[PDB]
Amino acid sequence: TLKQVIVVRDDLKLSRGKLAVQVAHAAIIGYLKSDSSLRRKWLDEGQKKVVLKVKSLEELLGIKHKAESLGLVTGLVQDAGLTEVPPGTITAVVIGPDEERKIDKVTGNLPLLKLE
Amino acid sequence: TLKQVIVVRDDLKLSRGKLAVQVAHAAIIGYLKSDSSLRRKWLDEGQKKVVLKVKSLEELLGIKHKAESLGLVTGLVQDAGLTEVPPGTITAVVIGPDEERKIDKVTLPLL
């Protein structure tokens, strides 16, 4: 089973609508950086995703590092459209799509991002 | 400037964390259905997006109808993995990316 994991920071003064935008950026970035075969199988399986959150940049990057150490494809989200944060600000990280069991070893215990 | 719009429904109550998932699904769907050249430029511009919410399914489909009348690419989001709701349930609609001047026209009360 394949899955794409998106992790966003909540420690930024971003509204629910702005966070949702960052989630959408992450989804696309992850798809674009993934293998053609992998992402095709992902789409056919329903492009499963889980969106989680962290409370700091260090925790966000810690997750990214761990995923990269395992060999997973990662992506960073830096939105120049955000005018209240300094340039280069990292709002989220994407992992996969890839094998769910492998990605879960990294983010299997993180809380869900609740925009509802 | 190019932009992609994603609209969700507040008359649809989803489980914890599911809303963010549907939004991500919409982004992908819109990207895939869009013109290769147009989306490429969109990405280079910073893949600008806006996420909105409407009253219910009727307003959501109304936006889809209006966008289609303007020649904008639209997509419906139906998540088979969302067993919490009946199959075929429309969770969102994605429009674009396309010229923000055109899509801004398709954008009734919001949120």
Side-chain angles (χ1 to χ4, degrees):
Chain A
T1 170
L2 297 179
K3 182 169 66 184
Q4 182 186 61
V5 177
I6 295 167
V7 188
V8 189
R9 290 171 59 184
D10 77 344
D11 67 311
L12 298 166
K13 307 300 188 177
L14 266 52
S15 64
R16 290 184 180 298
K18 297 187 186 304
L19 290 174
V21 167
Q22 304 309 299
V23 173
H25 287 156
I28 290 175
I29 290 170
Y31 174 86
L32 295 174
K33 301 181 72 176
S34 295
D35 172 66
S36 67
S37 174
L38 244 181
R39 67 194 194 184
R40 216 302 159 299
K41 184 164 173 291
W42 178 61
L43 290 177
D44 296 350
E45 293 184 10
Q47 59 180 303
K48 191 182 186 298
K49 301 175 187 63
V50 63
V51 189
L52 312 167
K53 70 164 195 170
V54 288
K55 311 193 75 64
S56 68
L57 176 63
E58 178 140 40
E59 177 176 45
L60 183 66
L61 296 181
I63 292 168
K64 184 172 178 285
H65 181 76
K66 192 172 193 303
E68 294 174 357
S69 295
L70 293 180
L72 295 164
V73 172
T74 58
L76 277 177
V77 175
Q78 289 172 290
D79 190 351
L82 296 175
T83 51
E84 295 306 332
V85 299
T89 297
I90 302 169
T91 63
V93 172
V94 57
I95 299 171
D98 211 312
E99 286 307 314
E100 179 169 54
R101 177 178 52 63
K102 193 169 182 178
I103 303 175
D104 282 354
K105 294 174 178 296
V106 182
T107 58
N109 201 215
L110 300 175
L112 301 160
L113 175 66
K114 293 165 274 59
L115 299 178
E116 55 278 322
Chain B
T1 303
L2 302 179
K3 185 172 62 187
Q4 183 186 62
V5 177
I6 295 171
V7 193
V8 295
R9 308 161 47 190
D10 72 298
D11 67 342
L12 181 59
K13 301 303 178 299
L14 259 36
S15 297
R16 305 158 64 69
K18 299 301 182 178
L19 187 155
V21 173
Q22 304 308 301
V23 171
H25 285 160
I28 296 292
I29 291 172
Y31 174 87
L32 294 173
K33 300 175 78 66
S34 298
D35 177 72
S36 60
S37 184
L38 194 165
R39 72 190 178 196
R40 168 197 155 67
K41 185 171 185 175
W42 176 61
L43 285 167
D44 296 312
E45 292 180 3
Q47 61 175 320
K48 186 179 182 179
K49 306 173 184 54
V50 65
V51 177
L52 309 171
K53 186 171 66 174
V54 286
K55 175 193 176 183
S56 69
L57 184 60
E58 185 136 45
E59 288 74 15
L60 185 66
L61 297 184
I63 296 174
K64 175 174 177 289
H65 183 77
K66 179 176 295 185
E68 290 172 354
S69 76
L70 300 181
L72 303 171
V73 177
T74 66
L76 288 176
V77 179
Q78 295 169 301
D79 195 350
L82 205 57
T83 53
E84 48 194 64
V85 295
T89 295
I90 300 173
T91 67
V93 176
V94 59
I95 300 176
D98 209 310
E99 306 186 306
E100 67 168 357
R101 188 180 185 298
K102 299 179 63 179
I103 307 183
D104 271 350
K105 295 178 180 176
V106 186
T107 307
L108 62 85
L110 304 178
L111 228 295

